[PDB]
RNA sequence: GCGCGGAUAGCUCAGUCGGUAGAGCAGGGGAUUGAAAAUCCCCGUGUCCUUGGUUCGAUUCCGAGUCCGCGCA
RNA sequence: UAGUCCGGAUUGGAGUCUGCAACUCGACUCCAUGAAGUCGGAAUCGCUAGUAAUCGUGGAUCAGAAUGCCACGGUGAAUAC
RNA sequence: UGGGGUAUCGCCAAGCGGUAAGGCACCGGAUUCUGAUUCCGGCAUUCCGAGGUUCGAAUCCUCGUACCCCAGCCA
RNA sequence: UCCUCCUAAAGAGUAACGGAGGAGCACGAAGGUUGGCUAAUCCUGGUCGGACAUCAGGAGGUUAGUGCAAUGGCAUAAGCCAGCUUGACUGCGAGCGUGACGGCGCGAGCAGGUGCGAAAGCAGGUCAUAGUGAUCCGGUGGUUCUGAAUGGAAGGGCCAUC
RNA sequence: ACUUACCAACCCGAUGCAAACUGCGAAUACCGGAGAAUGUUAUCACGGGAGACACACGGCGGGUGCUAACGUCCGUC
RNA sequence: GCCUGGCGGCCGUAGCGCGGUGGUCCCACCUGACCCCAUGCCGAACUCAGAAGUGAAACGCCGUAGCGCCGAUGGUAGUGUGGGGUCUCCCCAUGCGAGAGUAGGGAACUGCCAGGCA
């Protein structure tokens, strides 16, 4: 509720000012942030995906869900509805406590950070990008580790252009080299 | 020789020829050669035309076949019985009725369109006729 | 779209009751309104109507859009229809979950003596 | 190769427009729904439309997708 | 083909018996049909997956 | 949120080296001693270092 | 006439989604040897039968021919 | 009793010396890295006593460059029917 | 033309729908003055080509190719 | 032998050693009901991650799916997911369709008992059309219906069934 | 990363073909209802007796055949 | 009378696209969620308690024909019956008569009930 207060105040005065909105409600806010961590080497492994799953409940506060395969497909493997990756979708108060963890002491612990890329986004000002490693959350116990397992979040905002995206995601200081 | 690259269903029933043609004006080019007899044409015969053409009026020109065969024909062999199956496709004819542009031509003189007109309709068993582009 | 895919729950409920050719009572929850209104089998036509949009319920209520609000609308339209000689309905939930205020609406209709 | 084919099944329209059925009575033996049931008319398991009230059948267009329903005036 | 014929017994005191089928070997598990009793007139459970 | 099947989510304090005690809440059930934080983290120096070579 | 197998280096033959022509022997040069054979290494100006066409490009794909061979009412 | 406080290859950085000049292409040093290797298949070699084994030291060539060569000593066996 | 069979490492030849086994050869080491023999180690075919069923094809189905075997008769 | 399309001439039916394909099952959930949901494919962004495994957004519109061929159907879904379940009931059945017949099919409703649903209601198997075999002879369970003097029994019948 | 006489998806514009293609769609035929005239009930049901179940050509619509046959297989007259 | 909501008739002359406008009420987004209830994770959906804020999205209404859609008249094709020929195809008398295309029409029309404004 801290980066959901400093939205409230400055992020929708600031977007108010720079853009020449009419309403108050025209203005971006981030609707969800999706964690998935799509495995993929649980094909042979049920406690690889075991272990995929709590590293997702410890990195959020919310149990995965566990997804399936939406086609069978013969070049990785699979077959039609195995379990082959889990996700998280926060949204809400967890969202901005999430979201505050992440831009705040998650994104600078990161191996070689460079900053975050501006083109990465998908045309509509939806963020997405991917971690390397699990070790980067303070959550995850390095002692712990058997398997280096990245994962990929993705902000889903309500802008309409990735410009206005920049401008939403950029107000919360959120690097971008 | 044109023959579709793929079918659907290898044999066709025979079926007839009646009426007249959809393709009846000079489309694409400026001369044609349109039919005037009812007949079917095998795809040999429009190649045979079409060199006929093509040699006539040199390698100018643009030369637009406007039949495709499209319709297997099945013969039976030599000293085979009646029965037994429908028989083997041979070849490919297209069908024509009256009014079909055979061919059309453009970026010649006309002269020149008569005379690989003549040259080619001398190939195809069907009474044949000049055509020009005519405007509406 | 909520609205289309609220609809489209509705819609075999609907023809099923146009189809047995019952009298059937429509609800239709707003987050802030409810309506209730009994319609003959033709569909066409209705016969009774009560809502929170009508003064004669709103001034006598706290808040138009709870539970206390709908079980004063299946008051209402249970009182007016059996004063119109309609007995025996069919109710046309109209595509919410029967459970919450259209639930204490019908239980509401069910109390003061609509039959269904 | 070839050489085989089911028997004919009989389908189709049994009694036409303006026709005095009984209850009970097929009207249309078919495969899908290409004909809908409408008023007092029932559709069997094998998609046969029967005469579910006596009268005369009405076979009618309805709806937003032009669907052929089929009813029975009371008659 | 596979699946093999089974008879569905009463539970109540009566010889009377429904008859199905069963895939032996997908599903040894025995089935357990509360069926109706048309000597009892009443729907009593069913046993005997054969 | 369901109940229990979640992990639990308490509210901690973090601090780092630069001097900045944030309180937050992380389901780590400990507090939290870091280094980097989003203040005082070399990003801007880092930049200015890596473009500066040639 | 119809159905087939052939024409690629001096000789005897390989060679399919079209990609700078392959092998053995022969021939030439080198190493080795007293010398040579042998052995080892290196080296192909081949209208890929002729001729047109398609392609950016044909031994290869299409159209037409020449010669050799095999079989046929 | 561990691929380990074994083993030191390889590689990055920083240097010293010689020499007009260490890139191809020296030697040595310091920090870091820390492979392969856990006693070696068929087979094969040396040694009969200050010997084998093992431990160091010196010299020639040489500006600088030996794990080689030529010498020197320390400890010091087993076995030969 | 029909019916049947085969196509798997350079060669001959095993493969059960979830992995490719044998011999000869070839490669490296050793023995030997040198070569053969011998001994010690290795490697190795994603299974004729295309499409399909399957979660999965050398394996199952269909088609094409190439080679074998049997039949192609009475008049 | 059976199913689907065409031939087949806009009702039905319609032949050939005519053109094309399939079946000789599966399922105790893949059936019943209630509540909900909506595909293929392509584009963009994104850890390993790749032409194609998961995530997010957009275009798109059912080009998808339907246990297995083809045709006709399907959004109110007949497609997809979950809760509870046994109506994959027993006796009948107005009326029809379809066959030379044997036979085959559709069926509102009535009675008894049941499931789901708050209820209206829906449920006598599955989206439909294939998945099959008359009679005799005989096997197993039930029912005194018969039971060659009589009481039983044997055998027979009837119902279920192999 | 730099050039290119070659081919070409999708999309758009224009042109054809289809028994197993249809966002269209006749004539006819068929089913049902009413009405007039005409017809030796021509109609239906039940009962006695059959015969026949090798068809042929000709028109029209077709399959097969070579739009060959005094061919073959259907539909209808 | 104008606007809005519900349930229908009708099923593209009714749908799409582009542009403008609406919020007093209504509607929608919204605010919050410990409770009723819910997520194979998540109050996103479902649900509940509300009403601060905005009509941005949505939805409605008004324009606009770029498209979809409707669509004559005439002619053409086909075809029932009778007749004819040069007869695998056509012609004549006669009855029916398309599909496509053209001119054009065209951004709906309407019933019941309820609420707000005048
Ligand atoms: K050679
Ligand atoms: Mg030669
Ligand atoms: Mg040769």
Same mark, same amino acid.
């Given at each position: ?177 | ?36 007899? =009812? ?41 085979? =019985? ?31 369109? =008569? ?22 | ?6 609809? $489209?729950?509705?819609?075999?409920? $609907? ?8 009298? $059937?009572l429509?609800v239709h929850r707003t987050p802030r309104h409810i309506y209730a209104? #009994? ?11 009560a809502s929170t949009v009508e003064?004669?319920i709103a001034?006598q209520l706290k808040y138009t859009g709870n539970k206390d609000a709908a079980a004063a609308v299946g008051k209402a339209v249970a009182? $007016? ?7 025996? #309905?069919?109710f046309?939930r109209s595509?919410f979950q029967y459970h919450g205020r259209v639930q204490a609406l019908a239980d509401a209709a069910r109390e003061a003596?609509?039959?269904? | ?6 028997? /004919? ?26 004909? @809908?049931?409408? /008023? ?6 094998? @998609? ?28 | ?6 008879? &569905? ?21 025995? &089935? ?19 | ?11 901690? +304090? ?30 801007? +120096? ?6 500066? +070579?040639?």
């Amino acid at each position: 509720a801290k980066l959901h207060d400093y939205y409230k105040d400055e992020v929708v005065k600031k977007l108010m000012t720079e853009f020449n909105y009419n309403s108050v409600m025209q203005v971006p806010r981030v609707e969800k942030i999706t964690l998935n961590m799509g495995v993929g080497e649980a094909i042979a492994d049920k406690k690889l995906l075991d272990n995929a799953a709590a590293d997702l409940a410890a990195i959020s506060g919310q149990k995965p869900l566990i997804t399936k395969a939406r086609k069978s497909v013969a070049g990785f493997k699979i077959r039609q509805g195995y379990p082959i990756g889990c996700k998280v979708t926060l949204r809400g108060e967890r969202m901005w406590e999430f979201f505050e963890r992440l831009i705040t002491i998650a994104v600078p612990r990161i191996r070689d950070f460079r900053g975050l890329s501006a083109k990465s986004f998908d045309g509509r000002g939806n963020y997405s990008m991917g971690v390397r490693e699990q070790i980067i959350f303070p959550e995850i116990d390095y002692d712990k580790v058997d398997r280096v397992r990245g994962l990929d979040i993705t902000i889903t905002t309500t802008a309409k252009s990735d410009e206005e995206g920049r401008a939403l995601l950029a107000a919360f200081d959120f690097p971008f080299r | 020789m044109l023959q579709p690259k793929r079918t659907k269903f290898r044999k066709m029933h025979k079926g007839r020829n009646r009426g007249l043609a959809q393709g009846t004006d000079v489309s694409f080019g400026s001369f044609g050669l349109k039919a005037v007899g =009812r007949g079917r044409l095998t795809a040999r015969q429009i190649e045979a035309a079409r060199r006929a053409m093509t040699r006539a009026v040199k390698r100018q020109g643009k030369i637009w076949i406007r039949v495709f065969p499209d319709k297997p024909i099945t013969e039976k062999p030599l000293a085979v =019985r009646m029965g037994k199956g429908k028989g083997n496709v041979e070849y490919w004819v297209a069908l024509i009725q009256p009014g079909k542009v055979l061919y059309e031509m453009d970026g010649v003189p006309e002269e020149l369109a =008569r005379e690989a007109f003549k040259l080619a309709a001398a190939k195809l068993p069907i009474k044949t006729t000049f055509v020009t582009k005519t405007v509406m | 779209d909520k609205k289309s895919a609220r609809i $489209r729950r509705a819609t075999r409920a $609907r023809r099923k009751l146009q189809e047995l050719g019952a009298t $059937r009572l429509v609800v239709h929850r707003t987050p802030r309104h409810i309506y209730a209104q #009994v319609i003959a089998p033709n569909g066409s036509e209705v016969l009774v109507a009560a809502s929170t949009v009508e003064k004669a319920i709103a001034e006598q209520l706290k808040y138009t859009g709870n539970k206390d609000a709908a079980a004063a609308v299946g008051k209402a339209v249970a009182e $007016r229809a059996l004063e119109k000689g309609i007995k025996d #309905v069919s109710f046309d939930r109209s595509g919410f979950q029967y459970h919450g205020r259209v639930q204490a609406l019908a239980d509401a209709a069910r109390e003061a003596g609509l039959q269904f | 190769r070839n050489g085989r084919d089911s028997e /004919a099944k009989r389908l189709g329209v049994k009694r036409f427009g303006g026709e005095s059925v009984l209850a009970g009575s097929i009207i249309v033996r078919q495969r899908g729904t290409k004909f @809908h049931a409408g /008023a007092n008319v029932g559709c069997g398991r094998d @998609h046969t439309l029967f005469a579910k009230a006596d009268g005369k059948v009405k076979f009618e267009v309805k709806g937003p997708k032009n669907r052929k329903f089929i009813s029975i005036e009371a008659e | 083909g596979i699946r093999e014929k089974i008879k &569905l017994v009463s539970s109540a005191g009566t010889g009377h018996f429904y008859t199905t089928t069963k895939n032996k070997r997908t599903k040894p598990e025995k &089935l357990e049909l509360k069926k109706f009793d048309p000597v009892v007139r009443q729907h009593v459970i069913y046993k005997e997956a054969k | 949120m369901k109940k229990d099947i979640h992990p639990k989510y308490e509210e901690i +304090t973090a601090s780092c080296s630069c001097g900045n005690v944030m309180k937050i809440r992380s389901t780590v059930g400990h507090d939290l001693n870091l280094d980097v934080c989003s203040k005082c983290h070399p990003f801007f +120096t880092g930049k200015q270092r890596d473009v500066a +070579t040639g």
